[PDB]
């Protein structure tokens, strides 16, 4: 009895921490773009 091998099934991981950091950085830096007449 030889059961099918399933060890090859792999689930990838996502790494969007750069993009989240950029989004928070922009949400903070947009205060430097407010108009103060």
């Amino acid at each position: 009895v030889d059961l099918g091998d399933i060890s090859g099934i792999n689930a990838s991981v996502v790494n969007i921490q750069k993009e989240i950091d950029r989004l928070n950085e922009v949400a903070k830096n947009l205060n430097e773009s407010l108009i103060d007449l």
């Binding site: 099934i9 689930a11 990838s12 996502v14 969007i16 830096n29 773009s33 407010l34």
Partner: protein, 71 residues
């Protein structure tokens, strides 16, 4: 002078918004790719699991019948 200030602030804000939307698009693309790969992985696991339980079943029925023959 105030118009130049408004224009410069608006251009800076639009540049930052462009960078942020490119970042959001890249992040959504990566998340889509990873979620779809994980979905394909779960589906392939379900298929192989169904096949393996089918095999394990058939083997167990062979055992049970041949042991009924035994006893």
């Amino acid at each position: 002078e105030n118009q130049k200030l408004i224009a410069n602030q608006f251009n800076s804000a639009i540049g930052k918004i462009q960078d942020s939307f490119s970042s959001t698009a890249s992040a959504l693309g990566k998340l889509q790719d990873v979620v779809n790969q994980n979905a394909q992985a779960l589906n392939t696991l379900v298929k192989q699991l169904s096949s393996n339980f089918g095999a394990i079943s058939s083997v167990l029925n062979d055992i049970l019948s041949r042991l009924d023959k035994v006893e």
